[PDB]
Amino acid sequence: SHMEQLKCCSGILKEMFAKKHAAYAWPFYKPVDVEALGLHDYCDIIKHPMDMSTIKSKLEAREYRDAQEFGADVRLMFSNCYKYNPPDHEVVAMARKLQDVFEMRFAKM
Template sequence: SLVDRENKTLAEHNELKKAEDLWNRVKRMDGSGWNNDFGRDDKKRSESSSVKSKHRLERERKDKEEEGKLEQMFLLSEKRDQEKARDRAKKREEQRELAYKMEEEERRANIEREKEEALRKETPRQSLRRLYEPIFRTLWDLEFDNLNGANPFRIVIDKDTCAAIGAPDYCEVVKKPMNLTYIERKVTDEDYETLQEFFADVELLISNALLYNSSPSNEYHIAALEFKRRFKKLRKSLLTSLQQ
């Protein structure tokens, strides 16, 4: 209708008028106005970015602090675990040592009980043998430097062997031969009934050696004197211990 067309024309005129007014205002504005507006926007964006950066750095700092705390807690926990493990190992070692000591004490006690039991059961000759056998073993093990470490008193010399060892007249001079081998048999068989019987055989061995090798310079005579000295010392020690 005519009214509608007039209203439309009026509206278009108003819009055009607004556009012209806006354009005129723009033309009157210098470049600084635009620049200031854009500068303010840049400043706002920069400030916003700076704030965000600070917030990010603060979060990173807090995260690192938390990580440090967690690491310290982990190290502390690990240290406590290690200390507990060392304590457990130490206790186990102490328990093993205690068990070993108890076993050792029990073993020694058993040995002592066995010895006591054996002593109660042993015969008089067995008891006597425990006294003289150490002396015999010492005499058997003697070595003589002047004879290149040999011990001639172990050798059996009788009428069957004297010629073979270069002493054919031995049995003519020595009426009752005696040597450590003879004595060993009697020790093993527990033939001695008294200490004096054992001592007598050793003394007979010495006297035979000195009799047949009568020269003081004879190497067997020298060895016999050393044998005698050692025997007298051992006998004295035994008799002294028995008197205490």
């Protein structure tokens, strides 16, 4: 049962990586680089960082038990962005645009 659901999860993540969503999805592609961004307090506020490439690696390695574990990592990635940044920040608006894509596809599986 879980194997079919995880095939759909890979399909959702692939769509999140598509050129169609690139203008707002690009900050979530790779882990937040605290050194390059100069984010001295990021590791103190964000205990469990997450990004799309890490989620892709976990799916490839068959690390997820089911679809809800995949869903939890995607939501964690968005939660970290909302937590660290004030609500008027552009990255927050981009996270919400990409979450609308994830939430739509995920609710249909």
